[PDB]
Amino acid sequence: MRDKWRKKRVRRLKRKRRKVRARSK
Amino acid sequence: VLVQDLLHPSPATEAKQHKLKTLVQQPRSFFMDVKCQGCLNITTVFSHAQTAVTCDSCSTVLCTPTGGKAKLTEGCSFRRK
Amino acid sequence: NINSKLALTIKSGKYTLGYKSVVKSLRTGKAKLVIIAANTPVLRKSELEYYAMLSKTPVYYFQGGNNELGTVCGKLFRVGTLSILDAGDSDILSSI
Amino acid sequence: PGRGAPLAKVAFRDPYKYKLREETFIANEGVYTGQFIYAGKKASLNVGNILPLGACPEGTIVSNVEEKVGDRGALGRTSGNYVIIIGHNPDENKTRVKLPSGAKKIISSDARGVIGVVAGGGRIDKPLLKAGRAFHKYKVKRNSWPKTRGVAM
Amino acid sequence: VVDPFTRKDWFDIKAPTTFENRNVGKTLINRSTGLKNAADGLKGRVFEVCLADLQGSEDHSYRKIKLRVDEVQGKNLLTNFHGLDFTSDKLRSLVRKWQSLVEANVTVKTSDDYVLRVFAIAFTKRQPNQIKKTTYAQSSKLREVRKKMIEIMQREVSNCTLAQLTSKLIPEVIGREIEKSTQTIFPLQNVHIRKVKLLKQPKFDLGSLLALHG
Amino acid sequence: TKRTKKVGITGKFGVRYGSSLRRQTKKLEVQQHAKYDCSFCGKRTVQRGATGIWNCKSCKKTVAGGAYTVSTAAAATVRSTIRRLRELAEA
Amino acid sequence: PKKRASNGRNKKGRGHVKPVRCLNCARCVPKDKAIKRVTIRNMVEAAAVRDLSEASVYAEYALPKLYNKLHYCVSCAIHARIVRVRSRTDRKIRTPPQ
Amino acid sequence: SQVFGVARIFASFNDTFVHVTDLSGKETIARVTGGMKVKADRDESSPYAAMLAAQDVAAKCKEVGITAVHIKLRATGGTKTKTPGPGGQSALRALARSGLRIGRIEDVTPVPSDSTRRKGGRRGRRL
RNA sequence: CUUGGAUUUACUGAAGACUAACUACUGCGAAAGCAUUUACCAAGGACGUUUUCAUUAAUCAAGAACGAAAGUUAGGGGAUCGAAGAUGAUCAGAUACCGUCGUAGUCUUAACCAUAAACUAUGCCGACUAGGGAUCGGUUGUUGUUCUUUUAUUGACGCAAUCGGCACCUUACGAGAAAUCAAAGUCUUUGGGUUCUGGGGGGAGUAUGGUCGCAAGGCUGAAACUUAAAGGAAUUGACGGAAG
Ligand SMILES: [Mg+2]
Ligand SMILES: [Mg+2]
Ligand SMILES: [Mg+2]
Ligand SMILES: [Mg+2]
Ligand SMILES: [Mg+2]
Ligand SMILES: [Mg+2]
Ligand SMILES: [Mg+2]
Ligand SMILES: [Mg+2]
Ligand SMILES: [Mg+2]
Ligand SMILES: [Mg+2]
Ligand SMILES: [Mg+2]
Ligand SMILES: [Mg+2]
Ligand SMILES: [Mg+2]
Ligand SMILES: [Mg+2]
Ligand SMILES: [Mg+2]
Ligand SMILES: [Mg+2]
Ligand SMILES: [Mg+2]
Ligand SMILES: [Mg+2]
Ligand SMILES: [Mg+2]
Ligand SMILES: [Mg+2]
Ligand SMILES: [Mg+2]
Ligand SMILES: [Mg+2]
Ligand SMILES: [Mg+2]
Ligand SMILES: [Mg+2]
Ligand SMILES: [Mg+2]
Ligand SMILES: [Mg+2]
Ligand SMILES: [Mg+2]
Ligand SMILES: [Mg+2]
Ligand SMILES: [Mg+2]
Ligand SMILES: [Mg+2]
Ligand SMILES: [Mg+2]
Ligand SMILES: [Mg+2]
Ligand SMILES: [Mg+2]
Ligand SMILES: [Mg+2]
Ligand SMILES: [Mg+2]
Ligand SMILES: [Mg+2]
Ligand SMILES: [Mg+2]
Ligand SMILES: [Mg+2]
Ligand SMILES: [Zn+2]
Ligand SMILES: [Zn+2]
Ligand SMILES: [Zn+2]
């Protein structure tokens, strides 16, 4: 896939990890 | 040119070189004796003068500074010292 | 430009700084020039130039305030007015 | 109290009898104590002066403008607000102005106004932060605070 | 259904005496009725006619004059000067590459209080012996020429009435003086007053206008 | 020492009201408690009374200003605009 | 690899050049990179230059020209044959076609 | 001599306007468009439709008394193309060949001084 | 959208943007960037200099200033384009390309962000090695040239030198895998000074910790595991809804 969209996919997926981890803050 | 006399360059081509690019660097400027038309008083003036030089007798400007050589006013004759 | 001429007078000549000194110097005729800051009160200003008119002293109106007039004179304080008693190496008197 | 704009007390002489008249003007920003205020048709374009609308060129910033000739000020009286003069119609003796709400109004050119912006502007930029601050704000205005929601009654 | 052209009345357009061929042409308007007169709804019209037509000569083919009607006398329309402009093609033919274009404008009022904006344009001239491809003037010279343009337009307009100026515009008096005045700054070519706009007119004086019509 | 890292004067409000309201308050409340330079005597002795009121301790001149600064940008713009428009009218 | 020493534009000793819109597709293209052609065409086609001169009320009236400067992006120009693909050695030639 | 109108011809790439006014331009004498002569949108700007449009304009001009016109051709201008449409060339030739007399000719396209932003986006219209 | 007069036409007015043509293998700036006039404010390179000081210097972890666009916060503005969104088409399907509307945004004032193929994919200082014609800035000698004004002390142009720039053309002593390079040369005949970075391809700029940020995100940054290639330049062919 396009390198720019692969980075966007990971950025959106990094966003999910942060929100999920925040549950157990 | 593989062989060339670097120690004795032709004085014609030596004079076309930049002032810092001669064998021994030498200024191309000089000092002048300026006769204003109004009176007769020796005043030594640098060729590339940056000052509006005035003669002692009458407060009249002899030269105006420029980018390079100073420009002598009308009626002023110079002789290189 | 006038600032450079005034700075030389402070370095070499004689002067008084302040309203009380300037009025005394106008009374004795020892003043050569009176310099008034831009933000000087008009009542004090119109009185200072009445003393100078009587004393026959030219007055120069500085363009900056008393904060800027002090630092031109090399001072760390405010100068609302000053009088030049002796213009020394400078030629401020010849340029008004 | 109750006003965001400070008020200025300006003393004039009475033209007809030996007496001082103290007027209460809305202070424009830059007006100082001891300043001379000039009011009339022939007054000059200086901050704090009161001029007829026809004597001010387009783009003149003016405050405490009269809605009607001689009502002594109706428009642009709160802190930070002003009126911009848009243009003139000298044949009908009328002037177009822009009000703080953004509305364009046509006023008689003989109506007067005070040059400048009303002082105290920028007041709304700060949060009140407390119910008590609003209590004290309306303590010298009127009984309009606090408001119960009609849906909760 | 009605053929609205049966109710139209034709009027003749007369140019001021500053031009030669004063018979500009014809216009029409709804015929004067009881409610609305034809006269009042007819004044204020602007006609754009080529200056070559107003003078016969084709040397003025690149200038077009706006004429404003401001008095009606029967079937004759008494027009006045409303503006000046160049044709679009003439300007496009003057703006070449490898040269500098310099423009200036100034707002100035005439003797009779006609407020105008006058636009001047000029180009650098290539010398007959010039070898280099381009003809560029240094920005300092262009500032002096631009300054020279403004003070000439200001001088030659405020000292005369609008009618004399109209007689000045036709032979490029101002353009010839700018070229002469800037000779010591930089050689110039195609010095033209490329546009004149009327901004403000004085209070209407029918007697002054009537003198401009014979 | 430095007592607070960032709250500064709004440390009097503790943890209440929200950080955005406290940092917005801090900006405007430093300005309203500052000392400004007097245009009359030249000293930096001008302080606010109520909103729009700015007094000088030295020469006792009071000037009408903004709610939280002696002069707002809008007034400075109007001051130069009026100065400019005054020149044309008076030639 | 690098195809052209000029990078397909005319930017040397410069950081940024403001863009222009292609006449054909309105694509933003830098001013130095755009393929520019200056055209001075007769406003009336040669078939009609006679009858329009006869219909003219002016004896010996010269018809004005139509002056236009056209700006194209790379895709529009190649498609419209404004520029063509040249051989590797012929690309370097930048004199106007004879 | 002749009685002049002004033929304001607006020739875009989707239509062709043949509009004759008086000298002032405030009075319209005849306005026939290429779209009044055809029922297909694709050839509203065709040269054939412009010639028919010009002929109807010339016929209307004759019965009102207009014997000659000045030509002010224009394109769409603005942010769009400055070249005139295909119908502008036909309407001019048709007017000259219809017995009408021709005066001055000028291009009056609205040409900006670098103005507002043009439809299509940064990447243009992709086809 | 239109007989409720659309579109078009002339005249007039109001808003915001933006500075066409002149505009170039031209200029300036550390870079990002900078294009209407004039005024004001403070800078800058080059050139000229028989002025002055005398090693004050070169490159630089840490740390600072600036940093397109987009984006964030709060006011103001909101003409035009226009993410999102809504819509008409096309299609097998089309949330898209195309068309019509359109909100944030686009502009501005105070703060944030600190990223771009932020490119010359090419660090900076110093020396040398090769010819040529153009061009910008400065200086110095000189015309069958035009012009102030009639000429000079006008300005332009022309011919030579030179220093500095933006570039370009030819050659290859020399380099390179080649494409190509006046530097990418003076490198097995290997050392002028100095900063930063890479060590097969992925996993991966991922996880985690730290730090900056209001957020979006920025900086620093692994490992497990997997694989015999991945990749660069060029040649021939094949193919192309590319050109001749
Ligand atoms: Mg969940
Ligand atoms: Mg003091
Ligand atoms: Mg009331
Ligand atoms: Mg209550
Ligand atoms: Mg409630
Ligand atoms: Mg409520
Ligand atoms: Mg209840
Ligand atoms: Mg001169
Ligand atoms: Mg303590
Ligand atoms: Mg390729
Ligand atoms: Mg540079
Ligand atoms: Mg860049
Ligand atoms: Mg760039
Ligand atoms: Mg190109
Ligand atoms: Mg159509
Ligand atoms: Mg149609
Ligand atoms: Mg139809
Ligand atoms: Mg395509
Ligand atoms: Mg330039
Ligand atoms: Mg421009
Ligand atoms: Mg930005
Ligand atoms: Mg941005
Ligand atoms: Mg933004
Ligand atoms: Mg906003
Ligand atoms: Mg749109
Ligand atoms: Mg959509
Ligand atoms: Mg839907
Ligand atoms: Mg659908
Ligand atoms: Mg990066
Ligand atoms: Mg690049
Ligand atoms: Mg040179
Ligand atoms: Mg000699
Ligand atoms: Mg001169
Ligand atoms: Mg000169
Ligand atoms: Mg590796
Ligand atoms: Mg993982
Ligand atoms: Mg945080
Ligand atoms: Mg390959
Ligand atoms: Zn002497
Ligand atoms: Zn004070
Ligand atoms: Zn395109």
UniProtKB/Swiss-Prot annotation, chain A:
Pfam family, one: Ribosomal_L41
Keywords from the named record: Cytoplasm, Ribonucleoprotein, Ribosomal protein
Gene Ontology terms describing biological process: translation
Coiled coil regions, renumbered to chain: none
Region of interest (Disordered), ranges: 1-25
Record GO cellular component, one term: cytoplasm
Source taxon at top rank: Eukaryota
Compartments in which it is found: Cytoplasm
Matches recorded under InterPro entries: Ribosomal_eS32
Entry annotated with the keyword Cytoplasm: yes
Molecular function, one GO term: structural constituent of ribosome
Function: Component of the ribosome, a large ribonucleoprotein complex responsible for the synthesis of proteins in the cell. The small ribosomal subunit (SSU) binds messenger RNAs (mRNAs) and translates the encoded message by selecting cognate aminoacyl-transfer RNA (tRNA) molecules. The large subunit (LSU) contains the ribosomal catalytic site termed the peptidyl transferase center (PTC), which catalyzes the formation of peptide bonds, thereby polymerizing the amino acids delivered by tRNAs into a polypeptide chain.
Additional remark text: Initially thought to be part of the large ribosomal subunit. Crystal structures show eS32/eL41 to be a small ribosomal subunit forming a bridge at the interface of the 2 subunits.
Protein family membership: Belongs to the eukaryotic ribosomal protein eS32 family.
Assembly mode: Component of the small ribosomal subunit. Mature ribosomes consist of a small (40S) and a large (60S) subunit. The 40S subunit contains about 32 different proteins and 1 molecule of RNA (18S). The 60S subunit contains 45 different proteins and 3 molecules of RNA (25S, 5.8S and 5S).
Designated name of the protein: Small ribosomal subunit protein eS32
Swiss-Prot record, chain C:
Classification via InterPro entries: Ribosomal_eL30-like, Ribosomal_eL30-like_sf, Ribosomal_eL30_CS, Ribosomal_eL8/eL30/eS12/Gad45
Keyword Heme part of the UniProt annotation: no
GO MF annotations in UniProt: pre-mRNA 5'-splice site binding; RNA binding; structural constituent of ribosome
UniProt-listed Gene3D superfamilies: 3.30.1330.30
GO cellular component: cytosolic large ribosomal subunit
One GO biological process term: rRNA processing
Keywords: Cytoplasm, Ribonucleoprotein, Ribosomal protein
Location in or out of the cell: Cytoplasm
ATP-binding keyword on record: no
SUPFAM superfamilies: L30e-like (SSF55315)
Protein's job: Component of the ribosome, a large ribonucleoprotein complex responsible for the synthesis of proteins in the cell. The small ribosomal subunit (SSU) binds messenger RNAs (mRNAs) and translates the encoded message by selecting cognate aminoacyl-transfer RNA (tRNA) molecules. The large subunit (LSU) contains the ribosomal catalytic site termed the peptidyl transferase center (PTC), which catalyzes the formation of peptide bonds, thereby polymerizing the amino acids delivered by tRNAs into a polypeptide chain.
Family: Belongs to the eukaryotic ribosomal protein eL30 family.
Known partners and oligomeric status: Component of the large ribosomal subunit. Mature ribosomes consist of a small (40S) and a large (60S) subunit. The 40S subunit contains about 32 different proteins and 1 molecule of RNA (18S). The 60S subunit contains 45 different proteins and 3 molecules of RNA (25S, 5.8S and 5S).
Protein name in UniProt: Large ribosomal subunit protein eL30
Organism: Candida albicans (strain SC5314 / ATCC MYA-2876) (Yeast)
Gene field: RPL30
Curated annotation (Swiss-Prot), chain F:
Predominant location: cytoplasm
Cofactor needs: Zn(2+)
Family as reported in the entry's similarity comment: Belongs to the eukaryotic ribosomal protein eL43 family.
PANTHER family for the chain: 60S RIBOSOMAL PROTEIN L37A, LARGE RIBOSOMAL SUBUNIT PROTEIN EL43
Subunit structure, as described in the record: Component of the large ribosomal subunit. Mature ribosomes consist of a small (40S) and a large (60S) subunit. The 40S subunit contains 32 different proteins and 1 molecule of RNA (18S). The 60S subunit contains 45 different proteins and 3 molecules of RNA (25S, 5.8S and 5S).
GO cellular component: cytosolic large ribosomal subunit
Localization annotation: Cytoplasm
Protein name as it appears in the record: Large ribosomal subunit protein eL43
Gene3D superfamilies linked: 2.20.25.30
Alphabetic keyword roster: Cytoplasm, Ribonucleoprotein, Ribosomal protein, Zinc
A molecular function GO annotation: structural constituent of ribosome
Phylogenetic placement of the source organism: Eukaryota, Fungi, Dikarya, Ascomycota, Saccharomycotina
Residues given in the record as Zn(2+) binding sites: C38, C41, C56, C59
Biological processes per GO annotation: translation
Record SUPFAM superfamilies: Zn-binding ribosomal proteins
The protein's role, per its UniProt record: Component of the ribosome, a large ribonucleoprotein complex responsible for the synthesis of proteins in the cell. The small ribosomal subunit (SSU) binds messenger RNAs (mRNAs) and translates the encoded message by selecting cognate aminoacyl-transfer RNA (tRNA) molecules. The large subunit (LSU) contains the ribosomal catalytic site termed the peptidyl transferase center (PTC), which catalyzes the formation of peptide bonds, thereby polymerizing the amino acids delivered by tRNAs into a polypeptide chain.
InterPro entries in alphabetical order: Ribosomal_eL37/eL43, Ribosomal_eL43, Ribosomal_protein_eL43, Ribosomal_zn-bd
Pfam families: Ribosomal_L37ae (PF01780)
